[PDB]
Design a protein around this ligand. Structure first.
Ligand SMILES: CCCCn1cc(CCCSC[C@H]2CN(Cc3c[nH]c4c(N)ncnc34)C[C@@H]2O)nn1
Ligand SMILES: CCCCn1cc(CCCSC[C@H]2CN(Cc3c[nH]c4c(N)ncnc34)C[C@@H]2O)nn1
Ligand SMILES: [Mg+2]
Ligand SMILES: [Mg+2]
Lengths: 230, 232
């Protein structure tokens, strides 16, 4: 049987996932998370929100893999746009991810780099190819690019522009890199999907509060369409 | 259950080398999630030793693996740290009373720095283990300080950042893993003790000081950690 892990960061990012799948879920508490376990089209689906940020998302992804035996992990949620062509509600699939707030420059390491790791973490080529194929079939724009993750909500021109100049990132969030990193360490295929909620600038807090629901639903609907192909 | 299982963590290989040597028992090496776990028996206790690799994500992963895959009932962390206070000198030992993720910033939503919804700024460690540390330090006639440790994904090497950590969090030392290790332990209800020996002063010379004192400071912490395990 296929076991698929489905993650968001916030409750609001998984509410539409649970609703759209429309099946009965058993709630299983572990490590401060609640995992929603159900069956959908001959697949076991395990849905959870990690809570915000890198430590939360690292923990939850590790629990999904070790405790629930998931064979793939699909992340769905919202993100800040760093580029003019990614508008509110647009979908992005992460090709690579970086931890943008990592700084070991005192030892002459590039920003984002940790010894025994890499700046950029890869996601699954096969899953990203699937996303692109289905987006083309649905006539929805799906961009691909680098996502930057850190433990700060970005809401300034200065920081946005650093993420673009340093990492060539297209979007910013607080969990993708950690989720993809854990999946890489365990050899588990990972796809990170995000819908834009804000422009990561001085108005981002207000934009985020306004568009979280709609953008979360947009990502959730696309994630469901991916699970339908697995 | 019926057997005691103790997880022992460092961040870097250099922090666990003296731990493995000092325990002096045979370890089985078990690979999982990009870590190697060293599993042995010591004084009727199962000990599982690993280095996580540097920073918050690495240490979160490894601690979660220790708990879920190896069933550890306690986690003891040993390693080095930057001093933020004049009375913590190179080689001095500190036990963390509470820890904070100093680089967390959700201030755009009016949250205090360090705070994430559904969590807390300060993460507590085990009172019983910290009390044990203080008791044995007094017996050994070694100075053991206690205080707040700040953890983030930056090596701190500036006056400006040091002073922020003191003013914002009243931190005594800085490192890149303690808060994440303690956080994971809290989520799983596992007692945690974080021990650090000072390697540098988290200032403009910290890189050079760290390279000089990593080995000695790591050994100082490892030796103290072993003395704790001897009392469990
Ligand atoms: C949850 C408790 C209820 C009260 N409450 C809600 C909140 C909201 C905290 C949201 S932190 C951000 C989320 C969204 N998410 C993506 C994101 C979108 N835009 C971003 C940006 N500009 N910078 C960084 N990340 C983002 C990151 C984090 O999970 N604070 N208190
Ligand atoms: C396997 C190849 C390793 C090659 N290599 C080693 C290195 C050194 C990286 C060291 S990062 C720092 C370690 C030590 N440790 C504690 C620490 C002590 N002082 C601190 C300070 N001032 N600020 C923050 N943290 C510290 C954090 C991290 O594990 N770079 N390349
Ligand atoms: Mg088809
Ligand atoms: Mg001052």
């Amino acid at each position: 049987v296929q076991k698929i892990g489905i993650l968001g960061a916030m409750r609001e990012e998984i509410t539409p996932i649970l609703e759209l799948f429309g099946v009965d879920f058993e709630e299983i508490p572990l490590g401060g998370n609640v995992f929603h376990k159900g069956v959908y089209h001959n697949k076991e689906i395990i849905v959870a929100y990690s809570k915000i940020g890198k430590v939360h998302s690292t923990l939850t992804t590790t629990s999904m893999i070790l405790a629930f035996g998931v064979q793939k992990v699909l992340f769905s949620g919202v993100a800040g746009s760093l580029v003019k062509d990614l508008k509110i509600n647009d979908l992005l699939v992460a090709t690579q991810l970086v931890q943008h707030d990592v700084d070991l420059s005192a030892f002459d390491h590039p920003l984002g780099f940790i010894p025994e790791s890499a700046i950029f973490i890869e996601t699954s080529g096969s899953l990203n190819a699937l996303a692109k194929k289905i987006a083309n079939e649905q006539h929805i724009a799906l961009k691909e690019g680098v996502i930057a993750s850190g433990d700060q909500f970005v809401h300034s021109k200065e920081r946005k522009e650093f993420l673009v100049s340093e990492f060539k990132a297209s979007a910013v969030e607080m969990e993708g890199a950690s989720v993809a990193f854990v999946c890489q360490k365990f050899g588990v295929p990972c796809c990170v999907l995000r819908s834009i909620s804000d422009n990561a600038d001085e108005k981002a807090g207000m934009s985020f509060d306004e568009f979280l629901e709609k953008s979360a639903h947009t990502s959730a609907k696309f994630l469901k369409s991916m699970v339908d192909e697995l």
